[PDB]
Amino acid sequence: SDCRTYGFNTQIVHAGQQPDPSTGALSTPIFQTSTFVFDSAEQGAARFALEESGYIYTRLGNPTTDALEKKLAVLERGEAGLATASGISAITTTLLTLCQQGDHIVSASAIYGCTHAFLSHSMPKFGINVRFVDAAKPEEIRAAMRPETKVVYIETPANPTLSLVDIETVAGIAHQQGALLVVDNTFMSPYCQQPLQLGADIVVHSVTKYINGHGDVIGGIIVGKQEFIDQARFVGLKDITGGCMSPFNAWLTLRGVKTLGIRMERHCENALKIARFLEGHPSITRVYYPGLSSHPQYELGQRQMSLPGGIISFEIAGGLEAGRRMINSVELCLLAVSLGDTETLIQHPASMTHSPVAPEERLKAGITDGLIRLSVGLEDPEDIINDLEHAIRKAT
Amino acid sequence: SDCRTYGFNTQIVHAGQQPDPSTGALSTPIFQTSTFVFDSAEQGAARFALEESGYIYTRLGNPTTDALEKKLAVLERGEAGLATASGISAITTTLLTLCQQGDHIVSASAIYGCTHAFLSHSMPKFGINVRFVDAAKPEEIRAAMRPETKVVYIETPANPTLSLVDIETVAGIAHQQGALLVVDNTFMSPYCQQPLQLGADIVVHSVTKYINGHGDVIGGIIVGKQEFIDQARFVGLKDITGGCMSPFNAWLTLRGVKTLGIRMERHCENALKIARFLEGHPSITRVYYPGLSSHPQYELGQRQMSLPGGIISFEIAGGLEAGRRMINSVELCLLAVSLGDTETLIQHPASMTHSPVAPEERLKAGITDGLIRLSVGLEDPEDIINDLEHAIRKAT
Amino acid sequence: SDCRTYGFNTQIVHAGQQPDPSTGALSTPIFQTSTFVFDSAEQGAARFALEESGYIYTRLGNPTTDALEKKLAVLERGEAGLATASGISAITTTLLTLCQQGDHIVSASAIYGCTHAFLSHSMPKFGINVRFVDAAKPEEIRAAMRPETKVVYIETPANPTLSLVDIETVAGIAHQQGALLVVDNTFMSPYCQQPLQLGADIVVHSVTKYINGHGDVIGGIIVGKQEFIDQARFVGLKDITGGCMSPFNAWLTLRGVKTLGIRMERHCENALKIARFLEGHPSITRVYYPGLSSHPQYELGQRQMSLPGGIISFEIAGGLEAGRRMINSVELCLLAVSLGDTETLIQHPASMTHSPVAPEERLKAGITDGLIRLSVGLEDPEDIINDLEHAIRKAT
Amino acid sequence: SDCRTYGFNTQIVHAGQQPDPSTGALSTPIFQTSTFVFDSAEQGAARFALEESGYIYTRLGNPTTDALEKKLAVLERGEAGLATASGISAITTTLLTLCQQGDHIVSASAIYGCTHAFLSHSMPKFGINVRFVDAAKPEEIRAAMRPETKVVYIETPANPTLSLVDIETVAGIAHQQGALLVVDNTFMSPYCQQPLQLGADIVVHSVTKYINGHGDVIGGIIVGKQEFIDQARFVGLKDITGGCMSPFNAWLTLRGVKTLGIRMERHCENALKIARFLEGHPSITRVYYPGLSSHPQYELGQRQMSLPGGIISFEIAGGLEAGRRMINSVELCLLAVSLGDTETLIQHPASMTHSPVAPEERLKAGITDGLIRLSVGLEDPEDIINDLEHAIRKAT
Numbered sequence A, B, C, D: 001s002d003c004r005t006y007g008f009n010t011q012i013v014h015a016g017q018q019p020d021p022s023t024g025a026l027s028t029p030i031f032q033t034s035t036f037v038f039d040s041a042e043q044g045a046a047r048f049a050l051e052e053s054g055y056i057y058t059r060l061g062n063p064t065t066d067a068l069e070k071k072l073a074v075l076e077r078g079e080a081g082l083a084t085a086s087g088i089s090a091i092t093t094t095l096l097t098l099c100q101q102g103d104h105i106v107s108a109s110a111i112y113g114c115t116h117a118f119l120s121h122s123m124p125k126f127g128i129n130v131r132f133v134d135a136a137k138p139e140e141i142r143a144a145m146r147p148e149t150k151v152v153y154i155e156t157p158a159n160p161t162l163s164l165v166d167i168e169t170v171a172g173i174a175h176q177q178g179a180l181l182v183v184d185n186t187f188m189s190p191y192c193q194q195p196l197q198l199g200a201d202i203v204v205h206s207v208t209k210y211i212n213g214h215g216d217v218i219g220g221i222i223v224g225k226q227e228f229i230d231q232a233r234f235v236g237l238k239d240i241t242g243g244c245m246s247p248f249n250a251w252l253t254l255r256g257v258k259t260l261g262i263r264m265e266r267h268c269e270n271a272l273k274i275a276r277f278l279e280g281h282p283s284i285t286r287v288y289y290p291g292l293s294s295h296p297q298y299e300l301g302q303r304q305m306s307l308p309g310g311i312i313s314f315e316i317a318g319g320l321e322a323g324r325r326m327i328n329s330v331e332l333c334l335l336a337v338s339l340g341d342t343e344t345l346i347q348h349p350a351s352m353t354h355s356p357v358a359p360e361e362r363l364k365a366g367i368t369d370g371l372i373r374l375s376v377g378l379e380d381p382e383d384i385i386n387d388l389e390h391a392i393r394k395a396t
């Protein structure tokens, strides 16, 4: 019995999971319990000093959460996993585990906004400095390293613009200089990109997105070597963020992840079609999509990703006002944040998430007035395309 | 329609809750969603800049979690609430919201061990110093204050020993010197003690314990003024710990809390009886219980608590080995950590949670070799007493 | 280890439940699985012929549902239990298990309306006849028996009017004449009335009401001898109604039932007060409540019930229109059906559930124009009373 | 806004669902409530007489269950839907709605065993007769019709052997003679076969199988004309079986069904490969699979099914003992009943479900000693094939 051995689809379905030993129940039971019962005083002391296995209390670990963690470790080719309340909590639990006052981080600039603020306004208040670079240009990463640099942090593709970061090249710079690479692998799952295999040390995910895939879990997951994971758990989560995952949330995300392979295939085949349509459209000025040949890092993309992903950005003819009109005129696509659910979602960070954010903040930070982000769900592409077509046509 | 007005039991049942407006559904629906849908671009921008109500995304807020938060705010007489993944996350989200490098905390020594470690080994790594005092002696609290002291932190009664801390007296010292009081109100719920009414600024709870009351939720809750809560939410939780609560966990804890008044009454009436039995027992050397007249702070207890609580500590004749035997000989009482569930739980932090923790660490830190902690559940007291009687008799 | 031995409160908390054997998890795990895994072909054949224990498939049985079933069997002093999708399904699964075409039932007239219709319009279509009697007059029960009478069916107290049925006296008539007694014990739980101890053969409950107690489960439970239960399960449920219970619903109802003893105590102490207030009110013409001395079967009530229950009926000065006004004027009490939740619920079967049901159907069937039914929740009685007082005053 | 209009994948994702109107919550909320609250007495009377919309009480209907019901109605091209506790309860609720004593049913012989027993031993006890025919030979269906025949009942493909039934041809015989056709569409979902479009009147499903697809829900669904559905609901379910569905079970099955299109595609592409491998294997004597050209009804299959399905039966060299060995020697495939989960499941109704069922009962009833049924999950086919190959090789 070793699940690391089977093909990747078999692993998505089976790894971390086994029928319940005392009943045969095939679905992983929801161990919705806060506490666990020891059968002896000495056994309670054994477990508590970390001297024996296994369970003590849900903040510390849980058999439902354990399966999910073993699964994701397997899919990412990591040694171990640690689930968390949110993807944000996967990132902060990681970096607050790795960092004390006086340390330095080097970060991609082109990351998720809530990650940006943690690093911008919160990290330095604990005396941990962060320097921001265009991670697409790995020399910038080298140029910002310092003796106190403990961690280099990246997302690929980069949330807003779908630019890429060469992981292997970034792995070697960070390592040469004594730092760990931490890669947020959220936009791809491990079905699409495996940063650990490229030399990264830690992978984090918002399991909220594709891994759960169903738009009803907020959660995160950390994957890395056993020694780091143990600290992330017994200190970072146990003591610092306390962002542990509900066993219900674990069990939903195990449910969600069974269909990861086939949902990724369909997300990505759908998005390719939609992107090609967007490219040919006279009212669309630019399309950002790793699967379009016109993508500046297309070849990089072809080597480190099995699939170009379910996310498309694009700019519409006429900026802010046209984008507003278009986003108000979709009938199928839903106006919401988050991504990686089975429904097609659309966001206009210009008329929307960044509207009373002064025009000059915006542009510096990769966002245009016409920029629309699409999360492509599992609908028939024709239906999405016709909805897009209608609303674009409406708006220009 | 104002629920702050009704009696305390009516509030436990009703406050924060109303039948679902589009259906009439009386149970608060589980909004197990990650995302929310805006009906306009401009409405999405309104909400996002904090310019209009209400929902955007579950890490930020959720209608299920909102009810629980409004309930607990009401019961504690606070302005607002913020739920969290764990009670630990309620504490760290609070103090990491209030503290940057260079700040000082003054803390009770006699607190929950995981809180102790956060303050001992983790807080100072962000350049935040913590000084530990016997909070039972409020002069010690005064004596340790500094110009950079931002927060005073206490538990009452104090987790291990059930010693008390005079909240009103501690409120005034902390305030006189420009600091906030933060009180962990976990061992009491607000049905028993309301620290905010005594002058505390922030109350935190592990809702895992009594508030949920059913041993199947890990969760926490923060209560305080709107201005602090907004920061705890939009920065501390959104950005730093990311310890948000599953809407399922919220909905269980709303379920759990309906019966808070009657479960507290029964916990406390049961525990009083058991404590009086323990007092009269020739093989029990000491009993720690706020409702026993021999309690050193009995009068303090009588003024700041409506009820003496569901927790008893006691020492058994013969130390470590007798306590081990006793704890291995109970048949009804369950050997487990946590407290405040409907089953009677018993822990022996000597033979157990602190066994390969060298004898000298232990004693300094209030723990004796014979010390047993009982969480008294909802069983018939006679049954618990006879189980206790049998096992004590076994062990000496 | 035998839970039939402890006091009744200890049993409510513990019976049917034990910590999970492979993990120690104290909360009963939710085995939300459809299927179970056998470790051998021969073991799969063993279980399937009923030749060995235990689990095969959730329609047939489940470890979560099993606990609830063992609990309720214990509390009712029955041999075994069988959970169901609804209380209606507990009744039909019972009687369709016990009855073929040509059989006869004798039933109380004063039962739940949906039960009435099953017996009125549905039972006879399968060639099973039902005769309706005032079960309050046990001679009427004797007078309607026939050689083909297989079952006598009753509710006590009787849903609408809170009249009672003498179980022991009805047990002996039914038995003398070769029939089983089936008692719907829903309005009481087993904490209040134990019909099996009085000589009844089968007890059914809508666990939707008090047993779950939290207004978020639809469910039912059957309790009786092992031999009948096995048929109810392997034929009646497996083959006929197929009304099996979700393991989630089981697990909520196990959660709900932990607090049964204390919720019943509070329901009943609250209702007593409210009933006495209603009695003294000049605008209330009649009050129906087993705990009022003016109850016609008060002594019967005193002998077969530990407590008079949480349900009050009463008539208001001025009939239909006054009752409508009153029910529209309550502010705390919620206008809804069902009963036995933690919120106080109020229904006016006159202006409401039976309004376009012609005035003459109604009166025959125990209902008056002014009749209001209150399900008394866990609010402060004073608050309920003042709400009642206000609205009554409004309405007359 | 009309979802009947979009392509079939768009419908799987969207139909029956819309963001929550008072919050925007994109996931359909779990309305885990027993009861609903009316805002007026008169509105409570309106709804109750069926005079206005909408909700009254979960046994009767629920907004979570409603979505699932509207979805499945849409996917099957029916007018309405009604969810149930089990697939068995979808069938009995249907036929007990349509049948009184004296009526006749004509049924396929080759159906699910639990359906068989209901019809064999239970239906006739209510004075409802059933005649069993080889539904593969539609003349046999004609030959058994009677003046009192109300319903013809079929499964296609037929659970054990995967024989087919020509729906259109059977529709016309049943209709010509004044009967309704009822088709159990469980082995296909509506993604694969739409019996209603072929002239059937009622479709039932065990949603336990493919529709939920995740092996953690027991549930069923009825689809048909509004007039029949209303009776199935307000009488058959409300009064007779009472097999209503938990809103949690509904919400899981809505979750499960989002991925129906892609899970069916993968189930069926996987199974085709495995079947072709099984065909070429010298130790496999017979393979039953609608997608193999050697299937006797291959052309029928090609016309009424979009896809040949995820189920394979086959016989192994050497009968009972070889099948036992093989089924005990699989390492990936799980030994369990049920089908249509994401894991590959295998059953040997010879050494197993029918072992102490005397050899002569068996053979009559289509089962051979060597017969193995495979439910093909979402693993890599190569992995399943190699596991099959190994175990077959083991066993012969």
Ligand SMILES: Cc1ncc(COP(=O)(O)O)c(CNCC(=O)O)c1O
Pocket (backbone or CB within 6 Å): A085, A086, A087, A088, A089, A112, A114, A115, A155, A159, A184, A186, A187, A205, A206, A207, A208, A218, A219, A220, A337, A338, A339, B059, B242
């Ligand atoms: C790359 C990335 N990393 C982390 C997160 C944080 O995940 P949680 O919400 O679970 O804490 C997100 C969410 N980004 C939301 C999207 O841009 O709309 C993300 O896109």
Ligand SMILES: Cc1ncc(COP(=O)(O)O)c(CNCC(=O)O)c1O
Pocket (backbone or CB within 6 Å): A059, A242, B085, B086, B087, B088, B089, B112, B114, B115, B155, B159, B184, B186, B187, B205, B206, B207, B208, B218, B219, B220, B337, B338, B339
């Ligand atoms: C007083 C107090 N505060 C905070 C916590 C932390 O709660 P969470 O486990 O939800 O993170 C605990 C738990 N103390 C466990 C008991 O001493 O066994 C506590 O007792």
Ligand SMILES: Cc1ncc(COP(=O)(O)O)c(CNCC(=O)O)c1O
Pocket (backbone or CB within 6 Å): C085, C086, C087, C088, C089, C112, C114, C115, C155, C159, C184, C186, C187, C205, C206, C207, C208, C218, C219, C220, C337, C338, C339, D059, D242
């Ligand atoms: C006595 C009694 N028996 C059975 C039922 C049926 O229970 P389910 O709804 O779980 O199927 C009820 C519900 N009676 C609802 C009340 O009169 O408002 C009842 O009161």
Ligand SMILES: Cc1ncc(COP(=O)(O)O)c(CNCC(=O)O)c1O
Pocket (backbone or CB within 6 Å): C059, C242, D085, D086, D087, D088, D089, D112, D114, D115, D155, D159, D184, D186, D187, D205, D206, D207, D208, D218, D219, D220, D337, D338, D339
């Ligand atoms: C065709 C068919 N119809 C109805 C059912 C009944 O479904 P429920 O278990 O939800 O009540 C089944 C289950 N048949 C199980 C399989 O043969 O292993 C079935 O295969």
